[PDB]
Amino acid sequence: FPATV
Amino acid sequence: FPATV
Amino acid sequence: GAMGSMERASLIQKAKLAEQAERYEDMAAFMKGAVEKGEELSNEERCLLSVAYKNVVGGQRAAWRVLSSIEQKSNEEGSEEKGPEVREYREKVETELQGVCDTVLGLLDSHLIKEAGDAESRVFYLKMKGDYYRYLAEVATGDDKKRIIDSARSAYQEAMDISKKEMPPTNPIRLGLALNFSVFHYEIANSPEEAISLAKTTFDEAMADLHTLSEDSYKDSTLIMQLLRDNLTLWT
Amino acid sequence: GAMGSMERASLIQKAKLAEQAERYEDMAAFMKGAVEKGEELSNEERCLLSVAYKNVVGGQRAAWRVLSSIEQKSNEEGSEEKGPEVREYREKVETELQGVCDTVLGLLDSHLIKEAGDAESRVFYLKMKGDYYRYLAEVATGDDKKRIIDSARSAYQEAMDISKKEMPPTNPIRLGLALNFSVFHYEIANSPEEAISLAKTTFDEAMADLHTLSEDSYKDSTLIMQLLRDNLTLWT
Ligand SMILES: *SCCN[C@@H](O)C(C)(c1ccccc1)c1ccccc1
Ligand SMILES: *SCCN[C@@H](O)C(C)(c1ccccc1)c1ccccc1
Ligand SMILES: [Mg+2]
Numbered sequence: 001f002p003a004t005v
Numbered sequence: 006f007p008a009t010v
Numbered sequence: 011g012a013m014g015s016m017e018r019a020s021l022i023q024k025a026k027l028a029e030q031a032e033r034y035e036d037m038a039a040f041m042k043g044a045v046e047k048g049e050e051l052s053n054e055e056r057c058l059l060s061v062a063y064k065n066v067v068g069g070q071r072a073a074w075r076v077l078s079s080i081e082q083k084s085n086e087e088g089s090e091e092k093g094p095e096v097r098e099y100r101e102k103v104e105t106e107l108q109g110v111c112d113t114v115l116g117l118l119d120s121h122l123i124k125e126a127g128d129a130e131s132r133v134f135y136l137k138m139k140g141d142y143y144r145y146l147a148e149v150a151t152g153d154d155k156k157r158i159i160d161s162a163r164s165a166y167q168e169a170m171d172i173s174k175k176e177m178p179p180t181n182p183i184r185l186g187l188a189l190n191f192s193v194f195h196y197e198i199a200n201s202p203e204e205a206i207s208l209a210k211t212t213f214d215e216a217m218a219d220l221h222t223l224s225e226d227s228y229k230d231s232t233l234i235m236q237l238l239r240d241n242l243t244l245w246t
Numbered sequence: 247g248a249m250g251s252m253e254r255a256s257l258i259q260k261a262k263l264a265e266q267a268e269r270y271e272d273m274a275a276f277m278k279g280a281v282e283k284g285e286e287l288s289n290e291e292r293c294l295l296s297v298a299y300k301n302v303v304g305g306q307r308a309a310w311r312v313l314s315s316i317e318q319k320s321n322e323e324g325s326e327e328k329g330p331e332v333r334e335y336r337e338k339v340e341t342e343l344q345g346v347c348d349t350v351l352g353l354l355d356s357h358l359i360k361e362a363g364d365a366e367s368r369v370f371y372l373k374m375k376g377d378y379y380r381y382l383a384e385v386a387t388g389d390d391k392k393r394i395i396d397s398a399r400s401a402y403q404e405a406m407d408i409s410k411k412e413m414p415p416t417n418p419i420r421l422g423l424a425l426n427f428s429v430f431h432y433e434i435a436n437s438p439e440e441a442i443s444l445a446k447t448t449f450d451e452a453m454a455d456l457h458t459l460s461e462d463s464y465k466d467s468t469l470i471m472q473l474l475r476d477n478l479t480l481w482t
């Protein structure tokens with residue numbers, strides 16, 4: 001999965 | 006801590 | 011509410027203790043109680059709120075993906091019928107996830123966003139609104155799926171508009187908003203080119219502003235810039 | 247009970263799904279429902295029960311130790327008074343932990359142990375009884391602390407007596423019982439010499455029986471023997 005903050 | 010199962 | 015009898019300061023203190031103990035469900039309940047005291051949140055308190063619910067819903071999303079994968083495999087050709095159990099349990103976790111998202115969105119709507127006047131707080135809350143509509147969109151399949159997706163887009167877009175007018179391009183809230191909105195484009199809205207364009211343009215404009223920053227601000231900004239670069243590498 | 251309307255087989259199936267999703271609270275609730283159907287448990291079902299509650303209470307113990315450490319530091323010389331919050335929250339987690347232990351002990355007492363006639367199942371349940379009294383002993387401070395410790399000892403001791411009569415010295419349930427009873431001696435009963443003696447004698451007697459085993463049984467037994475050796479290295 002892609003990075004999120 | 007020591008190992009327990 | 012179960013936290014109505016506890017002091018606001020005590021709820022904040024216990025939220026920090028729960029974070030140290032990695033008890034994120036407790037942390038979220040404490041911060042829900044703090045928000046419902048009706049006072050605006052500080053910068054640090056906003057982080058306590060977002061960290062708690064990000065960890066709670068993050069675990070639910072991870073579990074939902076495990077169960078959804080099993081469910082899709084059970085519906086393949088040649089698979090033995092196992093009964094309704096996999097669908098039921100995926101639905102149970104999905105319903106709990108949606109409940110948490112509805113809870114967070116309720117706190118934002120009553121009344122965090124409407125009282126947030128400073129750019130930093132307003133963008134922070136609107137990013138959260140986009141995030142939790144995005145989590146609802148990840149599991150949506152019904153008549154309102156497009157409306158859920160557009161609710162995420164609308165919140166992200168208002169946050170972007172404010173952040174471009176009121177914050178420098180290295181601001182970590184602006185950078186994290188752009189990171190997540192880019193992921194929204196890629197994973198939710200089926201717009202990988204918009205996702206890549208937003209991540210690259212955000213990265214380049216932050217790069218050109220780094221020279222203005224202290225050592226500590228530089229560390230904050232470059233950390234999130236690396237996440238943008240990570241996604242671009244994943245997508246290209 | 248909330249699980250009374252679900253089929254036993256469906257509860258077992260969902261316990262396995264919850265394990266795959268690392269949803270151990272769900273897993274424990276499902277297995278609690280399965281036990282309360284009143285039928286005896288299979289070998290695999292006993293593992294589902296023990297894995298679920300071991301993970302739930304393991305997380306509570308980890309959190310309790312974090313909070314207890316903070317509480318002890320707040321009560322040191324020169325520490326600023328923070329109010330009752332640390333004690334309150336440690337008490338909250340402690341109470342939830344005790345509730346889980348009481349729940350497990352209730353399942354063993356009503357009526358898993360009394361219906362367990364085979365050595366493997368009876369030793370397994372009695373080991374669990376010792377384990378969850380040990381977890382209660384870890385947080386006990388009141389008038390019944392010695393009685394809690396002796397309840398753990400008594401359960402472990404009955405399990406040891408059966409296992410020495412009815413199981414080979416390489417049996418993994420016998421080995422895991424000895425491992426945990428040794429930890430009970432070291433950490434709970436203030437008897438490190440008994441802890442070391444039990445771990446060493448258990449290890450040596452298993453070593454001499456390995457030649458009787460298949461490759462797969464050998465792997466099971468030597469894995470737990472390594473845990474005995476790890477503790478002996480920690481203690482000597
Ligand atoms: S608020 C929790 C801690 N903040 C970080 O997670 C992060 C990356 C951030 C950025 C945007 C939205 C939410 C969180 C951050 C914020 C500020 C400075 C450095 C990092
Ligand atoms: S029952 C859960 C899986 N069993 C292992 O954890 C273990 C080590 C065991 C041993 C004693 C009590 C509980 C669990 C085990 C059992 C049987 C064979 C191999 C390992
Ligand atoms: Mg007050």
Ligand SMILES: [Mg+2]
Nearest residue numbers: 101104105149
């Ligand atoms: Mg649904």
Ligand SMILES: [Mg+2]
Nearest residue numbers: 204207208211
């Ligand atoms: Mg643009």
Ligand SMILES: [Mg+2]
Nearest residue numbers: 252253254255
């Ligand atoms: Mg039936």
Ligand SMILES: [Mg+2]
Nearest residue numbers: 337340341385
């Ligand atoms: Mg107490």
Ligand SMILES: [Mg+2]
Nearest residue numbers: 440443444447
């Ligand atoms: Mg002896």
